Ligand binder design. Structure first.
Ligand SMILES: [O-]S([O-])([O-])O[C@H](CO)[C@@H](O)C[S@+]1C[C@@H](O)[C@H](O)[C@H]1CO
Ligand SMILES: *[C@@H]1O[C@H](CO)[C@@H](O)[C@H](O)[C@H]1NC(C)=O
Ligand SMILES: [Zn+2]
Length: 1014
């Protein structure tokens, strides 16, 4: 195993280092506005060294954006695919690449058999080629790597099954900025090449000047280079035709033949395309070839890529003709005029890459190595696309919830083979495809029109319901004596209970467990733990009585705590935001202990008075002018007081101090240690009154944030033996700090209401001497070092915070982990900040055609970990990566993959068992079974189960290792006949494993294994 901490990789281009050196001046470069006037030596190409030009027809089909997926499919895409089939069938030399499999699959299953056969033939013969082959072309900023893998697998599995092809070249022309998580996943999924487009205009200029637009992209910690993936970065401002034939859009636009009036399109540079004829072909070719030779100067080989397409292009038959015929005339002339020394033709993406590598092998070029990312993107001037790191935060949080429910449903149901009547495969396929669809770069990014956001939400809601059905049927089967098990596959044996989604104050959706001497004395509940190690976590349920006690299935008492159910209300009468306690329902909380990838059953039983092993929290409402707060049968009376500073300590954990406004002010790690200043503050950013306006994509603040005026907010303090909390109703945010004995959990119920042109940010102020350095993660996979650059505007220093961020000095680190992707930064030494929501009245001119005014209440969750790190073995100052500590990593897992909770729905569970998986191996803490998926239906003689294993890398800080058993996923199910290492999509076998044992992987490595069972 490579050391990913101590050896700084030696690469030709390291993006953080390149950013430190670059000046980012936005000067007018001439016709290539963001470059310079390219010059070339006409003698470079000659009879023995020609410029091979591949023109690659393409059509960017967004799976939802300004129309929903189905609206686009009906109005545009089915026509594009139908006409592509006819035109490619009829014109053997014409070519076309396709990226979005969600649309292709939708189309293909509607085709008659004769057309399916015609389609397979034009793919088989190479005329229609799939690029990437994922369900979508995903966002690369907010997406979790697990979901990027899920959607890639969904599209490629469909392609393998129906088209018998697996793309090894990737095409990503529209994500807003690019992440190294893509080559990471692609290289481990058989890919050999990838192409990207949206990178900062300054970076395009800088790499173009050095001919570094093609590079071997390796991970920031990879010293050896085995993660490297050849990457082609396009050089210009857009993938449209005016910005793909060469440096001058005024000339390239003349070669987009769809821009001649009857189609309703024109060239904004005011020179229209002209039909090619024998009388103008020589002059037209001379212009085009000159553009091509200029573009060729920015690359190292004599093979040139010229994409030919735009959004939803190649729809009308007349469009196919006008593009094809004119280009065929140009190729015939150019290829027959020896003085150009060019051979041009339609081609596919793989053909381009194959020719580039043939040139490379001929010793024609050597390519530079590069590590780093390409955030944050600016397409021009100071227009940085950091707004979409936060836009539509309700759905960004929903993405993480569904991410987890999909993994839990696929894992719980993988243990058994299911009768087709159970519709398990059917519900999982729907859940994987709806979550996969949302990975689209207009989905999770929050950049679609209002009604399209609604469509994604409805689809994800359907997926959540599908997951719940599969999970509850699975739990019933796994914990019921086999000879008693009698499933009704349409019946709900259990109801899932989720405490944080949609969340308190968002939707009253949780069921109350109703107990009573005259109706039902007890109720079974079951917890599932998808992580491969034993885990304890507090869980809560709503119950109709405070007099409830908990036992495990051996009938051992379990210590519990009951607290009231508090809800916050904006009182339009008193004009205050204050809490009301339920007089009919209460929260019972207890520690559940669950086996690795297993289940544990408990019983809640009512009694007529205080049970021996249940305590009751005290509650203190701090506000001037209090009124009574009765709580029905709750045994402890609420207390009142004027606002004041408070301090709390649960268990032996940290002691937290709060200001009289209910916000954290300090954290004391141990009884001895100092009270470390850690202050939470909420602020707001506005929009500029002159110039460019912030919108769904762009963040264009009218200067640094201003503090939210807090007034004298109502603060609620609940203090219990297992859990305490401080909650405060601030304008637009009910802010809560919850303590359970370790790092606190923070929850924000964010309701930006009608605050137009406002972005609400949550900031942490400390005295940590971080200077201009901070760390943020990429796709929940790795942490990358960021350096705040004052030479760039505020919005350029915002980065994606998909799951965590931290700052540190030689002795102290503060890490903030998130349960949803949001945008954030560290704008001053000692600070961390992350945006909660943004409501923008104006459109930001990137084609959406609207502002963001559809905000709704969302419950954001976090864990806040203050730690001493002076004893940790950290990367040197020159290393571009950062790594979490064990505590921070576990805190992240508590947010993203919490225990799942199930309430038995009927009165009695006959044949109930107390546990499942007690014999599963409890793996080392840095290892995860990211995916467990049965890959065969029940009729298959040989059953196959796929596993994706990921090992992160945690800092060595002096805590002795200890125990843990080796995890061999191939022996998790019995009767194993074979074990194979496969690509991450499970589509190709890479290794036949000895003894049928799946070895664990190295730090920062991810592998996939498939076990076969007789
Ligand atoms: O913006 S508009 O001019 O409509 O169209 C452009 C040129 O065809 C496209 O690049 C728009 S891209 C397509 C869409 O997924 C992105 O959210 C847009 C971000 O700008
Ligand atoms: C699928 O493609 C392979 C080569 O890529 C070919 O040999 C095979 O016949 C095709 N169909 C099958 C047998 O699955
Ligand atoms: Zn797009």
């Amino acid at each position: 195993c490579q050391d990913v901490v101590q050896d700084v990789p030696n690469v030709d281009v390291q993006m953080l280092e390149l950013y430190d050196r670059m000046s980012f001046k936005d000067i007018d470069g001439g016709v290539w506005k963001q470059g310079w006037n390219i010059k070339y030596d006409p003698l470079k190409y000659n009879a023995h060294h020609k410029l091979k030009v591949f023109v690659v027809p393409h059509s960017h089909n967004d799976p939802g954006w300004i129309q929903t997926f189905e609206e686009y499919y009906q109005h545009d895409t089915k026509h594009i695919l139908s006409n592509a089939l006819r035109h490619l069938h009829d014109n053997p030399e014409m070519k076309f690449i396709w990226a979005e499999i969600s649309y292709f699959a939708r189309f293909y299953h509607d085709l008659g058999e004769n057309k399916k056969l015609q389609m397979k033939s034009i793919v088989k013969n190479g005329q229609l080629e799939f690029v990437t082959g994922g369900w979508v072309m995903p966002d690369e900023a907010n997406s979790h790597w697990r979901n990027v893998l899920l959607q890639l697998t969904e599209g490629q599995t469909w392609l393998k099954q129906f088209m018998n092809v697996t793309p090894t070249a990737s095409w990503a022309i529209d994500p807003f900025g690019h992440s190294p998580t893509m080559p990471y996943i692609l290289q481990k999924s058989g890919f050999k090449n990838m192409l990207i487009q949206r990178t900062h205009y300054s970076v395009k200029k800088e790499l173009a000047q050095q001919r570094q637009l093609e590079f071997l992209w390796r991970q920031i910690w990879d010293n050896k280079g085995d993660t490297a993936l050849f990457t082609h970065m396009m050089p210009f401002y857009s993938y449209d035709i005016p910005h793909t034939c060469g440096p001058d859009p005024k000339v390239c636009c003349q070669f987009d033949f769809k821009r001649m009036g009857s189609f309703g399109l024109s060239c904004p540079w005011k020179v229209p395309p002209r039909t090619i004829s024998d009388q103008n072909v020589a002059a037209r070719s001379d212009l085009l070839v000159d553009q091509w030779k200029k573009k060729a100067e920015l690359y190292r080989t004599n093979v040139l890529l010229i994409p030919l397409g735009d959004d939803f292009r190649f729809k009308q038959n007349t469009e196919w003709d006008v593009q094809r015929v004119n280009y065929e005339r140009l190729f015939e002339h150019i290829n027959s005029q020896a003085h150009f020394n060019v051979q041009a033709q339609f081609g596919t993406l793989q053909e381009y890459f194959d020719a580039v590598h043939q040139a490379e092998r001929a010793g024609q070029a050597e390519f530079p190595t590069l590590s780093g990312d390409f955030f944050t993107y600016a397409d021009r001037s100071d227009n940085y696309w950091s707004g979409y790191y936060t836009s539509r935060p309700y759905h960004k949080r929903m993405d993480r919830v569904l991410m987890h429910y999909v993994r839990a449903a696929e894992m719980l149901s993988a243990w058994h083979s299911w009768d087709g009547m159970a519709r398990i495969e059917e519900r999982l396929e729907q859940a994987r495809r709806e979550l996969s669809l949302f990975q689209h770069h207009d989905g999770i990014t929050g950049t679609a029109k209002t009604h399209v956001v609604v469509d994604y939400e409805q689809r994800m809601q359907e997926a959540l319901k599908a997951c719940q059905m599969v999970m509850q049927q699975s739990v019933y089967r796994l914990l019921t004596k086999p000879s008693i098990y009698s499933p009704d596959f349409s019946f709900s044996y259990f109801t899932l209970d989720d405490s944080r989604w949609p969340g308190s104050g968002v939707e009253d959706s949780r069921t109350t467990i109703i107990l009573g001497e005259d109706i039902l004395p007890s109720k079974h509940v079951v917890m599932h733990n998808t992580l491969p190690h034993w885990r304890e976590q507090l869980v809560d349920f709503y119950v109709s009585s405070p007099f409830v006690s908990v036992t495990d299935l051996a009938n051992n008492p379990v210590e519990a705590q009951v607290s009231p159910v508090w809800s916050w209300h904006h009182d339009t009468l008193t004009k205050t935001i204050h809490p009301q306690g339920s007089t009919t329902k209460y929260r019972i909380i207890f520690k559940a202990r669950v086996p690795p990838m297993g289940l544990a059953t408990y019983v809640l039983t009512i009694s007529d008075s205080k049970p021996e092993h249940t305590s009751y929290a005290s509650n203190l409402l701090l506000r001037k002018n209090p009124t009574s707060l009765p709580l029905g049968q709750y045994p402890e009376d609420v207390k009142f007081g004027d606002p004041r500073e408070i301090s709390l300590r649960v268990g032996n954990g940290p002691t937290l101090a709060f200001s009289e406004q209910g916000l954290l002010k300090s954290i004391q790690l141990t009884q001895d240690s100092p009270h470390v200043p850690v202050h939470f503050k909420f602020l707001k950013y506005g929009v500029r009154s002159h110039g460019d306006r912030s919108g769904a994509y762009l963040f264009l603040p009218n200067g640094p944030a201003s503090p939210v005026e807090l007034g004298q907010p109502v603060v609620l303090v609940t203090k219990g033996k297992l859990e305490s909390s401080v909650s405060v109703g601030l304008p637009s945010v009910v802010h809560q700090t919850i303590m359970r004995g370790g790092a606190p959990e923070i929850r924000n119920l964010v309701d930006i209401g009608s605050l137009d042109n406002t972005e609400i940010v949550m900031r942490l102020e400390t005295h940590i001497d971080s200077g201009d350095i901070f760390y943020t993660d990429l796709n929940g996979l790795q942490f990358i070092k960021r350096r705040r650059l004052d030479k760039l505007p505020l919005q350029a220093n915002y980065y994606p915070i998909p799951s965590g961020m931290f700052i540190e000095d030689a002795n102290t680190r503060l890490t903030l982990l998130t349960g949803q992707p949001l945008g954030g930064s560290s704008l001053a030494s000692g600070e961390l900040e992350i945006m909660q929501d943004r409501r923008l009245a104006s459109d930001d001119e990137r084609g959406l055609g609207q502002g963001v005014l559809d905000n709704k209440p969302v419950l954001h969750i976090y864990r806040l970990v203050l730690e001493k790190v002076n004893n940790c073995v950290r990367p040197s100052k020159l290393h571009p990566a950062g790594y979490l500590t064990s505590a921070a990593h576990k805190a992240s897992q508590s947010l993203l993959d919490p225990l799942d909770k199930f309430i038995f729905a009927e009165n009695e569970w006959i044949g109930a068992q107390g546990q499942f998986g007690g014999d599963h191996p409890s793996a080392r803490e840095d290892l995860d079974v990211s995916v467990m998926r049965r890959l065969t239906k029940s009729s298959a003689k040989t059953q196959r189960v796929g596993y994706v294993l990921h090992r992160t890398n945690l800092m060595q800080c002096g805590t002795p290792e200890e125990h843990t058993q080796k995890l061999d996923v191939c022996h998790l199910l019995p009767n194993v006949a074979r074990c194979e290492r496969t690509t991450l999509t499970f589509l190709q076998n890479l290794e036949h494993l000895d003894g049928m044992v799946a070895p664990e992987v190295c730090p920062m490595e991810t592998a996939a294994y498939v076990s076969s069972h007789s």
